[PDB]
């Protein structure tokens, strides 16, 4: 899949990659034991070969999802490819920037 930014602003795109705890889950979910996810833009290009990893239960889940994001400047096109383990984007965020601020952590 591909999206071309025609919104004259930067588009924040987010996705994930699923690392199951067992191979049974891998087969049941995606029907391949050799999985790849490719994300490509002119300023971001990364590839994923997620392998099984059984992990301690967090929220009662031995598996994980690694979360990833990037900015897509106008005119540029982002391309996803996968045979499994992809958590595709559904909504993205067309934003203009702003500059020089921070985050506050208080109960006021």
């Amino acid at each position, epitope marked *: 899949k591909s999206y071309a930014n025609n919104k004259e602003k930067e588009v924040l795109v987010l996705w994930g990659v699923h690392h199951p705890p067992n191979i*049974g889950d891998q087969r049941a979910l995606y*029907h391949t034991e050799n999985a790849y996810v490719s994300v490509v833009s002119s300023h971001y290009s990364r590839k994923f070969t997620p392998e099984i990893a059984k992990r301690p239960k967090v929220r009662d889940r031995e598996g994980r999802i690694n979360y990833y994001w990037t900015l897509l400047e106008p005119g540029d096109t982002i391309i996803f490819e996968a045979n499994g383990n992809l958590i595709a984007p559904r909504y993205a965020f067309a934003l203009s920037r702003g500059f020089g601020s921070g985050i506050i952590n208080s109960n006021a």
Partner: antibody, heavy 126, light 108 residues
Framework: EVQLVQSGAEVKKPGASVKVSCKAS????????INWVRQAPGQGLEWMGW????????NYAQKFQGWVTMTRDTAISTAYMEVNGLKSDDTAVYYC???????????????????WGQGTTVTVSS | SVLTQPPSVSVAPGQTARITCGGN??????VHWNQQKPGQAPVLVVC???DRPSGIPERFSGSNSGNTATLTISRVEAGDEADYYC???????????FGGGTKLTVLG
């Protein structure tokens, strides 16, 4: 109405082989697994495996790895269970099942068994 | 792994028949239950711990939690005398496992 119709009873002597058939009707034969489960006389259910008609991907249980061969055809909406090197303790009833219980969560993402065949009685005696 | 299921259970009509399916972390695996009357093939009665396929009386249900699942038959009748089996899918070994089964004896 979903229905699985299996082949007829078989009487074999040790060492022979069998090929049991399971012909499906009432749904698109390619959407769901075909599981195979046997039940020996008086004892309980023992799962043998599944084959997905669309991909041909197979899942064999450990006890049945190598002795058994699961296949399909798709054109006639039929799945096959071939057993080799038969022995008196292989005497049992062989059921096929449809993996049509679509999973509700990706936590337990398992296609459970909806519909069953009537069984195929296989007797192995010397 | 293994699923512990009591060999026999005795119950009187009009009562509530309660049956156990033992196992490790079975509460996160969502059990299914099959009814087998003698001379017939198995039949699905309870799916997903508490639910039913079309055509099953509402008095068939169940619960699942911790290390114990349970099938619950309210308002027991005589036509319910049969062998009951619980089944789960172990993702570790990628197997479908059954319990030893239970003979429900209705004292009529």
């Amino acid at each position: 109405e979903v229905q699985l119709v299996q082949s007829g009873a078989e009487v074999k002597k040790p060492g022979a082989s069998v090929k049991v058939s399971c012909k499906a009707s009432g749904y698109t034969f390619t959407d769901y697994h075909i599981n195979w489960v046997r039940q020996a006389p008086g004892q309980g259910l023992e799962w043998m495996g599944w084959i997905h008609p669309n991909s041909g991907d197979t899942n064999y249980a450990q006890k049945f790895q190598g002795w058994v061969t699961m296949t399909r055809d798709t054109a006639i909406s039929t799945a096959y269970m071939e057993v080799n090197g038969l022995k008196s303790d292989d005497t049992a009833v062989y059921y096929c099942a449809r993996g049509g219980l679509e999973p509700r969560s990706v936590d337990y993402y398992y296609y459970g068994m909806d519909v069953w065949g009537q069984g195929t009685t296989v007797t192995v005696s010397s | 792994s293994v699923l512990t299921q009591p060999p026999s259970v005795s119950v009187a009509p009009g009562q509530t028949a309660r049956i156990t399916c033992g196992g490790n972390d079975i509460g996160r695996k969502s059990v299914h239950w099959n009814q087998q009357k003698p001379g017939q093939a198995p039949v699905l009665v309870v799916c997903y711990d508490s639910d039913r396929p079309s055509g099953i009386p509402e008095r068939f249900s169940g619960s699942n939690s911790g290390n114990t699942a349970t099938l619950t038959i309210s308002r027991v009748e005589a036509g319910d005398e049969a062998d009951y089996y619980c089944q789960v899918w172990d993702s570790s070994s990628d197997h479908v496992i059954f319990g030893g089964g239970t003979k429900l004896t209705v004292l009529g």
